[PDB]
Amino acid sequence: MNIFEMLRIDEGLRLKIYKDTEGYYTIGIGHLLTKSPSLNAAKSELDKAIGRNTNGVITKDEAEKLFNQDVDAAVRGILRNAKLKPVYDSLDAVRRAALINMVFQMGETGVAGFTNSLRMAQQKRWDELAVNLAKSRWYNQTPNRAKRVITTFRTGTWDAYK
Ligand SMILES: [Cl-]
């Protein structure tokens, strides 16, 4: 188990433009295209992202390329963030995967805001972190995925994914 396999399970793979759980136009492996209510705008972004006239449909290979770029950006976003970097540095490999997953899903800025949980994570207070993470919109909107990430963070093992 690794971050790639972990996110591929959490996000699935879709080759045609679709709406995410928030209702945003997405594609591939959780690749958000735009928050705008327009499919054309989505198609525009899609074509610009892929570099060809796609017509709202891509290949597996294209989905995987977007996915590689997105995981990479998530990591780099973490390392560049003053609030996140130190948390990350202090964690074991499994738990880093948990943090990366949250970032990929909610953006750096979003996670950077979980002030209290970041502190608990840093103090390695696992059970408390788990409780605190659960009191969030994130958990209430996507509970199964959230439970998976939380267990990973709490336990430091890949059990929730096995
Ligand atoms: Cl892009």
Ligand SMILES: [Cl-]
């Ligand atoms: Cl869910």
